[PDB]
Design a protein around this ligand. Structure first.
Ligand SMILES: Cc1cc2c3c(c1C)C(C)(C)C[C@@H](O)N3c1c(nc(O)[nH]c1=O)N2C[C@H](O)[C@H](O)[C@H](O)COP(=O)(O)O
Ligand SMILES: Cc1cc2c3c(c1C)C(C)(C)C[C@@H](O)N3c1c(nc(O)[nH]c1=O)N2C[C@H](O)[C@H](O)[C@H](O)COP(=O)(O)O
Ligand SMILES: O=C(O)/C(F)=C/c1ccccc1
Ligand SMILES: O=C(O)/C(F)=C/c1ccccc1
Ligand SMILES: [K+]
Ligand SMILES: [K+]
Ligand SMILES: [K+]
Ligand SMILES: [K+]
Ligand SMILES: [Mn+2]
Ligand SMILES: [Mn+2]
Lengths: 500, 500
């Protein structure tokens, strides 16, 4: 099966790309695997595959770290994400995000049910496993638990059967047969949980699949619309119906090639201690345990020689930046366009710790709107900050057509030079806030409300008659012929490759 | 003479450092010299020395571009600035700024008058030069004039003789014997101009010296206090009295080794067209000409084989960033400390286009103040934004002791994750604003007032009981022994020099 449709083939693709380091000597899941992975993420090194994990027994489990992190080279910077999607390894972020949005105006391609698959090669019932006996990583030294779940897909279905959601949400081992995890509004796992709670009759049938098809984990990380079954979206995006197999203990369906599957229930009544966890913004607050949702595990199935993917998240750059930020930005771009706003591109700059999204404006269309900064900022913020796709984003930066929003240096330049603090901004205090940002949940104000802003880095004439400056840069402040002459004579004169 | 005391020796130092490219074939001062220099600045390449400038006659002049720009290597990134100051080329920015502040609590060392020097090797009277006939550069294609003056030092003295100021301010050729330039409040050239205007009796005696002692051009770029004669400050900083020679046509004194000296007057009545100019924030607004100050040139003196330094300023990184921003930040650090504020370090991040200054707080001292964010922010902003040292800076970012303010990535991280937009900020609308920032002079509000903010990126417990987090990074989220093990085994396992 293709790499974007089979995790085991994805691992092979990373090997072939010279983007994998296989570590065949013993590595401790208590911190060491995650420390190596952290170092990888901070230096854009090759992904580590831990083939000899202290505590692995009966095939459970190897670990792949940094599955969606960056490569060092500029030319294939996003190559791991491209390998999730069947794209060339040199694909740009625009091309990756366009691929992730492509299914949004296609008919879904529903999944195909098959009778078995690799994920059924081994099984452990309720009498045969103990989650505390598996080589679950301690990812950060102050974490409140061993976070088994950093890159698997939770599967839950609405009570009426019409919507099956796939999503990433963290979870840690609570005891031999339970996890605790985050289940928070407005996330779809929470929305579906609330449907079951209102019905009041049973716990939520649940499965958690690790090492799923890479294209599926990408959609799991993206805020596609309410009510949309990710499996059919991924089907449409990839042009192929995904092959799923039924769980043994419930009637949910998991990818046939999943490395590891947990089957059980998400409680509608029970909670347990959850966190703290070293999180996407770069912090852990030791001892901030809170009650989280509680999952009961009834069965484990797994591939021979199963591999657990792991995100050692925190400071730049890991999956929580490359995937959460970029995929939210993609959805926000679409949302703006569907609300008749003249946005061409959106990206969450890494420099912002993916708390900002820069929105590139088609300023020809803006001019035809005959509007003003105050009005336009309000319109944009109302659309984005009132929608789930905007949940994680606290600052929107509006920029004109000269800015490449995928280049953080240019976003920072535009923000710093074109947006007058205060006057060119609109604050939003009556919107949902993202509590995980330190200045929210550990800050001076309400954890769950406000703290958002639209920062207008459009210059005044961009609303009226057109750009009225040239940059004081090599590109814009010298004629073409002269620039070329300079470039052609650069090494002759004594001054100093794309792939590298 | 030493490199920090003699520009001609500074050029030799750049050569010896393998930090100079000598271009001995003809180069056009109409754009080509500045385009090469711009490319250098955008790529941190070696400084260009244009020895064969089309239009050079009778020794006037060669050009050195990028005299204070960055080197590519991290180890000697700031080596050109270190060579202005007799510091090792690996000096850190903290060490450079400490050197520039060192004279602030030393007795001045007044200059020594000598009877002659190299700057008297050649002269041209009022009948022998024409400024329009010199190889003055056109620096940016849309500039409103040929900017002769981008890295020389204006010399003006108070009417009472007690204060002689040295400063950089731009100026362009107006006609055969006049320049126009910026002379704007609160700058000391403006303050002194206003003294002469109130006296009303004569134009201001003036000199403009190019290729001055490097230590002197650094002080010329720094907002040392009102009333302080830069020559004595530089004397104290360097431990040596600077040697000056009298002008021929007035009683001002210029550095003996100056490459080129213009002598004349700054009018108290006349103006002429000035600008536009491709400026430090990265923009030019073609056609925004304004009236500027008008200088009359009565005499030129110059060294044999004179060299004119030139800043091809604009987008990152050039002298307007490395010197304006950093030196303002240094002065702001001192100002805060003299106002009993617990600031240890200050830097203007390049990413901010040097419009922000990050202030590192000694949080032990902060805790002892038993204050709050609102109160502290107000105090800091009142001190800085009401002072000339704060003129160019529109955003102050307060950070705790874990942040290295000289590392823009860490400042951006702290800003983005610790400062809640709105609530953790105080806007200042009744302070002097810096009109050259596009969002000021070409923005939606008053060009000269407001648009400033203090952004508090201190977390709440930093005011009370102490930091309550650990970073989710390799450094902080793993024990020492494990980190070292990982590092020691890094290349063994298969993963990937300081000078490079
Ligand atoms: C890629 C990725 C996504 C997430 C997470 C991680 C990774 C690697 C963790 C390392 C596990 C850290 C964690 O905080 N985490 C996480 C999370 N969403 C939550 O509700 N809860 C979480 O604990 N998302 C984000 C969500 O996956 C997206 O917001 C997605 O949009 C949700 O799907 P849906 O609700 O839109 O269907
Ligand atoms: C290093 C450097 C400094 C400056 C400038 C440049 C360089 C390279 C130009 C390339 C020429 C561009 C220009 O905008 N420019 C400039 C300027 N100050 C002005 O009042 N006017 C100017 O036109 N400063 C800044 C001043 O030099 C400092 O603010 C200094 O503090 C002033 O001295 P003082 O008034 O404190 O004595
Ligand atoms: O645990 C975390 O670091 C995390 F990113 C959680 C999260 C992300 C997006 C949306 C909701 C929660
Ligand atoms: O012309 C310029 O680009 C410029 F930076 C001017 C300036 C800088 C600092 C203070 C005052 C003016
Ligand atoms: K999803
Ligand atoms: K604006
Ligand atoms: K000065
Ligand atoms: K704060
Ligand atoms: Mn969903
Ligand atoms: Mn001064």
């Amino acid at each position: 099966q293709p790499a974007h449709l089979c995790f085991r083939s994805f691992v092979e693709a990373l090997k072939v790309d010279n983007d994998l380091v296989e570590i065949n000597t013993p590595i401790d899941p208590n911190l060491e695997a995650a420390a190596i992975t952290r170092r990888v993420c901070e230096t854009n090194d090759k992904a580590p595959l831990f083939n000899n994990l202290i505590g692995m027994k009966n095939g459970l489990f190897r670990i792949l770290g940094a599955p969606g992190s960056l490569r060092k080279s500029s030319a294939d910077r996003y190559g791991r994400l491209a390998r999730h999607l069947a794209l060339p390894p040199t694909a740009s972020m625009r091309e990756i995000l366009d691929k992730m949005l492509s299914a949004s105006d296609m008919p879904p391609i529903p999944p195909t049910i098959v009778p078995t698959g690799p994920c059924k090669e081994n099984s452990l019932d309720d009498s045969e496993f103990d989650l505390t006996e598996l080589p679950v990583p301690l990812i950060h030294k102050s974490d409140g638990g061993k976070y088994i779940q950093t890159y698997g897909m939770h599967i839950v279905q609405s009570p009426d059967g019409t919507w099956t959601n796939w999503s990433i949400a963290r979870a840690m081992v609570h005891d031999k047969n339970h996890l605790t995890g985050l289940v928070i509004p407005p996330q779809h796992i929470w929305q579906i949980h609330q449907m079951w709670k209102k019905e009041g009759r049973s716990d939520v049938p649940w499965a958690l699949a690790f090492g799923v098809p890479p294209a599926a984990i990408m959609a799991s990380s993206m805020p596609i619309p309410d009510g949309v079954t990710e499996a059919g979206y991924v089907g449409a995006m990839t042009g192929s119906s995904l092959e799923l197999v039924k769980c043994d203990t419930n009637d949910l369906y998991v990818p046939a090639t999943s490395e590891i599957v947990l089957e059980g229930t998400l409680s509608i009544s029970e909670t347990g201690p959850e966190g703290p966890f070293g999180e996407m913004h770069g912090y852990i607050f030791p001892g901030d345990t809170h009650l989280g949702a509680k999952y009961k595990v009834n069965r484990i199935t797994y591939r021979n020689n199963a591999i657990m993917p792991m995100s050692s998240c925190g400071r730049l750059t890991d999956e929580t930046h490359t995937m959460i930020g970029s995929l939210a930005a993609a959805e926000i771009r679409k949302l703006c366009q569907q609300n008749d706003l003249p946005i061409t591109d959106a990206f969450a700059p890494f420099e912002s710790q993916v708390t900002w999204v820069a929105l590139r404006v088609d300023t020809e269309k803006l001019r035809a709107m005959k509007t003003t900064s105050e009005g336009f900022r309000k319109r944009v913020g109302d659309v984005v900050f009132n929608h789930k796709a905007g949940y994680t984003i606290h600052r929107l930066v509006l920029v004109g057509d000269d800015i490449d929003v995928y280049e953080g240096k240019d976003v920072l330049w535009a923000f710093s030079t074109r947006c007058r603090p205060g006057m060119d901004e609109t604050l939003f205090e009556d919107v949902r806030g993202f509590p995980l940002i330190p200045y929210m949940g550990h800050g001076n104000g309400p954890a769950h409300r406000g703290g958002k802003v639209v920062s207008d880095a459009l210059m005044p004439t961009e609303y009226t008659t057109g750009r009225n400056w040239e940059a004081a840069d090599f590109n814009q402040s010298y004629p073409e012929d002269l620039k070329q002459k300079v470039l052609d004579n650069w090494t002759k004169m004594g001054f100093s490759h794309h792939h590298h």
